[PDB]
């Protein structure tokens, strides 16, 4: 264990709270990001109809990237 000044990975090694819910994966299994409510997308980040945060460059790149395929739907980017 470790002090409340540190957040425990689900591995055994604990990183500080400033590194938790900061948009950066610094847990081996990512248990420091996929628990907090910071679901915001960046200024340049495209948003799927499914809510996933995908880079804007990935949109209509020719290959499906997002779970629902909205990134490559003909409606979302005309072809």
């Amino acid at each position: 264990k470790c002090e409340p000044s540190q957040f425990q990975c689900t591995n055994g090694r604990c990183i500080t709270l400033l590194w938790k819910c900061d948009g950066d994966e610094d847990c081996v299994d990512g248990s420091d990001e996929k628990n907090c409510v910071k679901k915001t997308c960046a200024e340049s980040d495209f948003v799927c109809n499914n809510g996933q945060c995908v880079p804007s460059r990935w949109k209509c790149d020719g290959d499906p990237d997002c779970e629902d395929g909205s990134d490559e739907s003909p409606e979302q980017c005309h072809m």
Partner: protein, 52 residues
């Protein structure tokens, strides 16, 4: 409650002589030097040190 990043001062150089030490301290900003003896009497000191 949260966590703040605070400065770490320059590690002092210790000059050793008979029953005493000399601390050559470098501090660009006011820094706290606290000492105390580990016996029956503390003789604790406190000083805010600026400069070398």
């Amino acid at each position: 409650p949260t966590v703040c990043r605070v400065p770490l001062a320059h590690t002092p150089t210790v000059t050793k002589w008979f029953k005493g030490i000399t601390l050559h301290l470098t501090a660009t900003r006011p820094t706290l030097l606290t000492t105390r003896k580990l016996g029956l009497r503390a003789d604790a000191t406190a000083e805010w040190i600026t400069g070398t």
